[PDB]
Design an enzyme around this catalytic site. Structure first.
Site, PDB file in Angstrom:
ATOM      1  N   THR A 263     -27.190  -9.197 -34.048  1.00 37.91           N
ATOM      2  CA  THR A 263     -25.762  -9.421 -34.250  1.00 37.91           C
ATOM      3  C   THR A 263     -24.976  -8.954 -33.003  1.00 37.91           C
ATOM      4  OG1 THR A 263     -25.775  -7.338 -35.395  1.00 37.91           O
ATOM      5  CG2 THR A 263     -25.731  -9.320 -36.782  1.00 37.91           C
ATOM      6  N   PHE A 388     -17.475  -9.018 -40.200  1.00 39.28           N
ATOM      7  CA  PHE A 388     -18.214  -7.856 -40.673  1.00 39.28           C
ATOM      8  C   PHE A 388     -18.300  -7.814 -42.203  1.00 39.28           C
ATOM      9  CE2 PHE A 388     -16.753  -6.659 -36.423  1.00 39.28           C
ATOM     10  CZ  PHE A 388     -17.949  -6.360 -35.875  1.00 39.28           C
ATOM     11  N   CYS A 395     -20.066  -4.422 -43.214  1.00 40.13           N
ATOM     12  CA  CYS A 395     -20.888  -3.810 -42.200  1.00 40.13           C
ATOM     13  C   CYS A 395     -20.551  -2.348 -41.982  1.00 40.13           C
ATOM     14  CB  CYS A 395     -20.618  -4.547 -40.907  1.00 40.13           C
ATOM     15  SG  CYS A 395     -21.678  -3.901 -39.525  1.00 40.13           S
TER      16      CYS A 395
HETATM   17  C1  HEM Z   1     -21.319  -7.573 -33.955  1.00 43.75           C
HETATM   18  C2  HEM Z   1     -22.290  -6.956 -34.617  1.00 43.75           C
HETATM   19  C3  HEM Z   1     -22.471  -7.004 -36.118  1.00 43.75           C
HETATM   20  C4  HEM Z   1     -22.082  -7.931 -36.976  1.00 43.75           C
HETATM   21  C5  HEM Z   1     -21.344  -9.209 -36.754  1.00 43.75           C
HETATM   22  C6  HEM Z   1     -22.488  -7.499 -38.287  1.00 43.75           C
HETATM   23  C7  HEM Z   1     -22.239  -8.142 -39.500  1.00 43.75           C
HETATM   24  C8  HEM Z   1     -22.543  -7.718 -40.787  1.00 43.75           C
HETATM   25  C9  HEM Z   1     -22.231  -8.381 -42.012  1.00 43.75           C
HETATM   26  C10 HEM Z   1     -21.537  -9.750 -42.102  1.00 43.75           C
HETATM   27  C11 HEM Z   1     -22.671  -7.626 -43.005  1.00 43.75           C
HETATM   28  C12 HEM Z   1     -22.584  -7.923 -44.515  1.00 43.75           C
HETATM   29  C13 HEM Z   1     -23.826  -8.663 -45.008  1.00 43.75           C
HETATM   30  C14 HEM Z   1     -23.801  -9.188 -46.427  1.00 43.75           C
HETATM   31  O1  HEM Z   1     -22.734  -9.214 -47.073  1.00 43.75           O
HETATM   32  O2  HEM Z   1     -24.908  -9.578 -46.904  1.00 43.75           O
HETATM   33  C15 HEM Z   1     -23.291  -6.451 -42.443  1.00 43.75           C
HETATM   34  C16 HEM Z   1     -23.868  -5.397 -43.116  1.00 43.75           C
HETATM   35  C17 HEM Z   1     -24.499  -4.283 -42.589  1.00 43.75           C
HETATM   36  N1  HEM Z   1     -24.598  -4.004 -41.241  1.00 43.75           N
HETATM   37 FE1  HEM Z   1     -23.704  -5.064 -39.704  1.00 43.75          FE
HETATM   38  N2  HEM Z   1     -23.195  -6.320 -38.181  1.00 43.75           N
HETATM   39  C18 HEM Z   1     -23.159  -5.981 -36.852  1.00 43.75           C
HETATM   40  C19 HEM Z   1     -23.709  -4.846 -36.321  1.00 43.75           C
HETATM   41  C20 HEM Z   1     -24.301  -3.768 -36.976  1.00 43.75           C
HETATM   42  C21 HEM Z   1     -24.877  -2.578 -36.398  1.00 43.75           C
HETATM   43  C22 HEM Z   1     -24.827  -2.239 -34.930  1.00 43.75           C
HETATM   44  C23 HEM Z   1     -25.407  -1.849 -37.380  1.00 43.75           C
HETATM   45  C24 HEM Z   1     -26.116  -0.518 -37.330  1.00 43.75           C
HETATM   46  C25 HEM Z   1     -25.952   0.378 -36.370  1.00 43.75           C
HETATM   47  C26 HEM Z   1     -25.199  -2.578 -38.598  1.00 43.75           C
HETATM   48  C27 HEM Z   1     -25.591  -2.195 -39.887  1.00 43.75           C
HETATM   49  C28 HEM Z   1     -25.298  -2.822 -41.076  1.00 43.75           C
HETATM   50  C29 HEM Z   1     -25.632  -2.317 -42.372  1.00 43.75           C
HETATM   51  C30 HEM Z   1     -26.437  -1.083 -42.696  1.00 43.75           C
HETATM   52  C31 HEM Z   1     -25.112  -3.245 -43.334  1.00 43.75           C
HETATM   53  C32 HEM Z   1     -25.168  -3.101 -44.836  1.00 43.75           C
HETATM   54  C33 HEM Z   1     -23.977  -2.291 -45.363  1.00 43.75           C
HETATM   55  C34 HEM Z   1     -23.990  -2.120 -46.863  1.00 43.75           C
HETATM   56  O3  HEM Z   1     -24.172  -3.150 -47.565  1.00 43.75           O
HETATM   57  O4  HEM Z   1     -23.859  -0.972 -47.360  1.00 43.75           O
HETATM   58  N3  HEM Z   1     -24.541  -3.762 -38.339  1.00 43.75           N
HETATM   59  N4  HEM Z   1     -23.172  -6.533 -41.076  1.00 43.75           N
END
Ligand code: HEM
EC number: 1.14.14.1
Length: 450
Positions: A263, A388, A395
Site C-alpha cells: 500500500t 484508509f 487503517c
Molecule cells: C498508503 C498506505 C496504506 C493504505 C492506503 C492502507 C489502507 C487500508 C485500508 C483501506 C484498510 C481497511 C481494510 C478493510 O476495511 O478491509 C486498512 C487496514 C489496516 N491497515 Fe492500512 N493502509 C496503508 C498502510 C498501512 C501501514 C503502513 C500499516 C502498518 C504499519 C497498516 C496497517 C493496517 C492494519 C493493521 C489494518 C487493520 C485495522 C483494523 O481493522 O483494526 N496499513 N488499511
C-alpha cells in the site's frame, strides 16, 4: 427501486464481464455505465458495488454495517491469523489489539519512529546516489524494499537489509510468496496444487519461526526499543486488563508487513508517476522540499511542514488508492439510500477509486491531477475521501504510512531531479493492492550531502 445490474449470461451470471486480471479497473468501467450502485453476481456469490459519497456515507454507519472478511482476507488469514487486518470486529483479539495499539500508531507516536524511518530513507537516497551514469531506477521495487525495511525496523527492530541484496531476506521471500499464493487461490484439492500447499505451509513456518524467535529474544533481554514490539510486550488492554499473548503479537507483526508494505510503496510510486507527468506540480513540490528540508536529514517538525508534498500524496491516493476496495456486511435487514432493501448478511463493496471520482463532490475534472483539491482538507465532506477505510476498522497505520511517504518523497525531491526516460505508459497491476507495474525513472543527483 430494483438494483441496477450488468447483463447476466444464464448460470454464468455476470462473470463473463470480468475476464481480466484487472477487476477493479473493469468494475470502475461498469460503474461509469450503471452509476452509484450495482449488483454483481457470479456462480454461487453476490455483492453490491458502491461508488457515490451518498451511499458510501450510509454504508459507513457502524450501527448498520460492519467489516466483512472478503475471500481474499480469509485466505490471507491463513498466515496473518487474528491480527487486526484479518479479524472480525467481534473477536476478542481484535478489540484487545485495537485498544492496545491505537496509542502506538498516533501522530504523536510518529516522533518515536522518525529516526528509524530516516535510517532506511537515507539508505534509499544513497543507493540512488551510487548508480552509475545511464543506470535507472525500478520505482515500485525500490519503494517496496524501503517500506518492508522501515516496517521491520519500526515494527520489531529487525533489519531485513533489503538494499544489500538481490534476493530478499528469506522472511520477505516467504511472505511475498504466501501473499501471492493467497491471491492466486481466488479445483484446489487437485494434485497439481500439492506443491503450492507444501510451499505455503513452508512459508508459514519461515514467518512464524523468525517472528516467534525475536519475540522470545526480546522478552529474555528486557531490552526496551522504539518499536511496536516493545509497546505490545508492555501494553495492557484497559477493558480486559490483559496483554496480547505471544502468538497474537506474532500475527500483528506479520500483519503490519502485509497491510503496510505494498500500500505504502504503491502510494510513493503513484505519487512519483504523477509528478513526472505534471512538471509544474513537480516544481512546486521540489521548491517546498528545498525550502523546508534545510538540515542534513529531516526532522519530525520539518516533515510536518511539507504541506504541498502532503497534498501531492493525498491526490495520488484520490486517483489510485492503493488498497482499492473494502467489504462490508449488513448487520440486520435495512434499506440503503431509501431505495434498496438489503437482508442481514448481504455484502457491499466500497469501490474507492470510483468514490474518489464522484463528480458531485469533486467537480467535472476528476481525472486531472490537482493537489490544490487538498489545500483545505477539512473542507472535503466526510466519507468523500476514504483511502484508509472506515471507522473503527480504518487503517491503524495511516499516520505511519503518511509520515513515511511524506518524509521519503520530500527527501527524493530534495536530492534528485527525475526523468521519465521511457515515457512510461501507466499499467496498473492488481493484487491485494495497486501499483504502476514497470514504472522506471532516471534520477540525476543534485549533489546535496546527507
Ligand atoms: C498508503 C498506505 C496504506 C493504505 C492506503 C492502507 C489502507 C487500508 C485500508 C483501506 C484498510 C481497511 C481494510 C478493510 O476495511 O478491509 C486498512 C487496514 C489496516 N491497515 Fe492500512 N493502509 C496503508 C498502510 C498501512 C501501514 C503502513 C500499516 C502498518 C504499519 C497498516 C496497517 C493496517 C492494519 C493493521 C489494518 C487493520 C485495522 C483494523 O481493522 O483494526 N496499513 N488499511
Amino acid at each position: 427501486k430494483e438494483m441496477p445490474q450488468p447483463k447476466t449470461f444464464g448460470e454464468l451470471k455476470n462473470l463473463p464481464l470480468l475476464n481480466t486480471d484487472k477487476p477493479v479497473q473493469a468494475l470502475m468501467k461498469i460503474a461509469d455505465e450503471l452509476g452509484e450502485i450495482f449488483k454483481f453476481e457470479a456462480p454461487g456469490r453476490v455483492t453490491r458495488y458502491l461508488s457515490s459519497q451518498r451511499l458510501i456515507k450510509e454504508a459507513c454507519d457502524e450501527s448498520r454495517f460492519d467489516k466483512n472478511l472478503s475471500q481474499a482476507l480469509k485466505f490471507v488469514r491463513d498466515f496473518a491469523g487474528d491480527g487486526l487486518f484479518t479479524s472480525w470486529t467481534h473477536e476478542k483479539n481484535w478489540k484487545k489489539a485495537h485498544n492496545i495499539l491505537l496509542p502506538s500508531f498516533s501522530q504523536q507516536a510518529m516522533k518515536g519512529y522518525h529516526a528509524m524511518m530516516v535510517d532506511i530513507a537515507v539508505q534509499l537516497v544513497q543507493k540512488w546516489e551510487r548508480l552509475n551514469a545511464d543506470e535507472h531506477i525500478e520505482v515500485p521495487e525500490d519503494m517496496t524494499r524501503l517500506t518492508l525495511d522501515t516496517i521491520g525496523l519500526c515494527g520489531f527492530n529487525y533489519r531485513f537489509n533489503s538494499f544489500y541484496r538481490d534476493q530478499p531476506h528469506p522472511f520477505i521471500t516467504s511472505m511475498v510468496r504466501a501473499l501471492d499464493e493467497a491471491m492466486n487461490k481466488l479445483n484446489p484439492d487437485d494434485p497439481a496444487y500439492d506443491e503450492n500447499k507444501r510451499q505455503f505451509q513452508e512459508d508459514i513456518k519461515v514467518m512464524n519461526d523468525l517472528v516467534d524467535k525475536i519475540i522470545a529474544d526480546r522478552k529474555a533481554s528486557g531490552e526496551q526499543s522504539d518499536d511496536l514490539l516493545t509497546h505490545m510486550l508492555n501494553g495492557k488492554d484497559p477493558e480486559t486488563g490483559e496483554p496480547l499473548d505471544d502468538e497474537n503479537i506474532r500475527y500483528q507483526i506479520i500483519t503490519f508487513l502485509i497491510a503496510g508494505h505494498e500500500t505504502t510503496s504503491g502510494l510513493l510510486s503513484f505519487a512519483l508517476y504523477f509528478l513526472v507527468k505534471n512538471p509544474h506540480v513537480l516544481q512546486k513540490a521540489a521548491e517546498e522540499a528545498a525550502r523546508v528540508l534545510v538540515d542534513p536529514v529531516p526532522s519530525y517538525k520539518q516533515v510536518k511542514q511539507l504541506k504541498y508534498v502532503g497534498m501531492v500524496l493525498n491526490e495520488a491516493l484520490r486517483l489510485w488508492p492503493t488498497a482499492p476496495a473494502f467489504s462490508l456486511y449488513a448487520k440486520e435487514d435495512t434499506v440503503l439510500g431509501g431505495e434498496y432493501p438489503l437482508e442481514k448478511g448481504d455484502e457491499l463493496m466500497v469501490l474507492i477509486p470510483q468514490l474518489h471520482r464522484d463528480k458531485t463532490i469533486w467537480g467535472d475534472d476528476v481525472e486531472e491531477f490537482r493537489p490544490e483539491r487538498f489545500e483545505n482538507p477539512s473542507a472535503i465532506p466526510q466519507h468523500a475521501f476514504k483511502p484508509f477505510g472506515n471507522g473503527q476498522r480504518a487503517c491503524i497505520g495511516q499516520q505511519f504510512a503518511l509520515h513515511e511517504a511524506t518524509l521519503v518523497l520530500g527527501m527524493m525531491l530534495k536530492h534528485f531531479d527525475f526523468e521519465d526516460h521511457t515515457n512510461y505508459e501507466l499499467d496498473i497491476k492488481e493484487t491485494l493492492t495497486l501499483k504502476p507495474e514497470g514504472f522506471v525513472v532516471k534520477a540525476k543527483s543534485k549533489k546535496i550531502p546527507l
